Amino acid sequence: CEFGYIYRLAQDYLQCVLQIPPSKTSRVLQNVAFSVQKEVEKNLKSCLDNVNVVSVDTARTLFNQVMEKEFEDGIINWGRIVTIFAFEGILIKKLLRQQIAPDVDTYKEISYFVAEFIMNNTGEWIRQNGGWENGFVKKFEP
């Protein structure tokens, strides 16, 4: 159920960002990830403007490059996993405005590569640190 669960989280988060009509974990994540997204958006502002996410291919490429640079030091923690969702939110927003061929069904592909990255690169750490219910939620819930 690993991949599917993360996929469900990545998908809930972008439906939240795109304001379109979730578990406790997901409600907790949306709230903390969105807070981080706003902070990233203003601080990395000028830098993101000079990149046009005109397609899902570009979005996937940009996501993977950014994620690789972020996690290349081998460090993994809940704070960082939360920024993954924040970044996906930034990408969907840029895609909604810049996607040349507006395919309102590419947002599922985004949730897919977000899940893929998380699963293959932090899945083991997540498990060893309590999973979503006993790791993430315990640490970020009210």
């Binding site: 981080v36 601080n43 990395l44 950014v66 690789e68 972020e70 704070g79 970044f87």
Partner: peptide
């Protein structure tokens, strides 16, 4: 390191 490192910095920031 552009965006990647910034996200790491913010991530470690909200993790603590």
């Amino acid at each position: 390191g552009q965006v990647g490192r910034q996200l790491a910095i913010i991530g470690d920031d909200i993790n603590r």
